[PDB]
Design a protein around this ligand. Structure first.
Ligand SMILES: CCn1nc(-c2ccccc2)c(C(C)=O)c(Nc2ccc(C(=O)O)cc2)c1=O
Ligand SMILES: [Mg+2]
Ligand SMILES: [Zn+2]
Length: 322
């Protein structure tokens, strides 16, 4: 009877503001797994890419296992969330039939792994602490590079290769795409990504959106997953505040070590100069709203509803200030 109620909630997989935490619990902490499975089913991807179902579950389960249950934000639930968000984003009327099946798969898949094996501290933290990871990747997109490496390496476990029936050309192309996307989730590439998104809205054409070259398509996709990645101030409030509590719990833990090692405690990593609300408003006025406002223009007027809520949410966090 608890698979019934989970089935009931999964009917919302096409809606923005899906109850993803309820889904987490109602599935035995298998949100990324059930949610990926429902999306592939809904989009017919198993049939299109001849992915055996046995193979699909194994893989998602192993992937999901490689999210850390003990980091509050960058876990399987967040992974589940971005995935589902990108999926809805994919479906916006203004993108109808712009993207191939294989382009679609990359964006969903990449969303699925974009933070796999995240340790719960930031790139900058890992660079500062001369960490084993940061030494590996020469201080450059340290974590993103990592999530990709892990996401790809898992395909190699017994009965995990969900790409086995793609052609060689298909595999090359999807590998590149997934790499180009996950790497674009590095928060220091934000300003440049967005500036590029702004030129594209500046010189866009319609028919529905028109793009005739890899580099225009991959950009849109990268920004789409960036949006999904940075999509939680745009969900209904009860959801977004839980996400805040969480990332904040993760940061405070970082700064407990940042203050412990004795570096200068990051900005907004100090549980004693917590300005949580002030920091969402700022995060929205300078990062999230500029971003979404822009995406909403590319797909005018499909994202209108998402942008409204965003502004209801901000106007709420502000109400909590003085
Ligand atoms: C709950 C919503 N929220 N809030 C903040 C936010 C928090 C405090 C101050 C300023 C911003 C952040 C941040 C810090 O950027 C969110 N997401 C992130 C995305 C990417 C990275 C990254 O290291 O690559 C980190 C976090 C976020 O989801
Ligand atoms: Mg990330
Ligand atoms: Zn993320």
């Amino acid at each position: 009877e608890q698979e019934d109620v989970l089935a009931k909630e999964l009917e919302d997989v096409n809606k923005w503001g899906l109850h993803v935490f309820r889904i987490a619990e109602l599935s035995g902490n298998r949100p990324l797994t059930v949610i990926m499975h429902t999306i592939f089913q809904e989009r017919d991807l198993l049939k299109t890419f001849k992915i055996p179902v046995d193979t699909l579950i194994t893989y998602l389960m192993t992937l999901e296992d490689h999210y850390h249950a003990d980091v509050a934000y960058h876990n399987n639930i967040h992974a589940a969330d971005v995935v589902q968000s990108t999926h809805v984003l994919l479906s916006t009327p203004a993108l109808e039939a712009v993207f191939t099946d294989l382009e679609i798969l990359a964006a969903i898949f990449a969303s699925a792994i974009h933070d796999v094996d995240h340790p719960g501290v930031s790139n900058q933290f890992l660079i500062n602490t001369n960490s084993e990871l940061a030494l590996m990747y020469n201080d450059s997109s340290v974590l993103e590079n990592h999530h990709l490496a892990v996401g790809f390496k898992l395909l190699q476990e017994e009965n995990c290769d969900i790409f086995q029936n793609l052609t060689k050309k298909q595999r090359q192309s999807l590998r590149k795409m997934v790499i180009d996307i996950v790497l674009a989730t590095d928060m220091s590439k934000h300003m440049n990504l967005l500036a590029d998104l702004k030129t594209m809205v500046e010189t866009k054409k319609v028919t529905v959106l028109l793009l005739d070259n890899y580099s225009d398509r991959i950009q849109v996709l990268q920004n789409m997953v960036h949006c999904a990645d940075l999509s939680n101030p745009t969900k209904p409030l009860q959801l977004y505040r839980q996400w805040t509590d969480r990332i904040m719990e993760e940061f405070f833990r970082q700064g407990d070590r940042e203050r412990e090692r004795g570096m200068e405690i990051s900005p907004m990593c100090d549980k004693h100069n917590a300005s949580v609300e002030k920091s969402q408003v700022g995060f929205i006025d300078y990062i999230v709203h500029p971003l979404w406002e822009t995406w909403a223009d590319l797909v005018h007027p499909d994202a209108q509803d998402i942008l409204d809520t965003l502004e209801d949410n901000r106007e709420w966090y502000q109400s909590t200030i003085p």
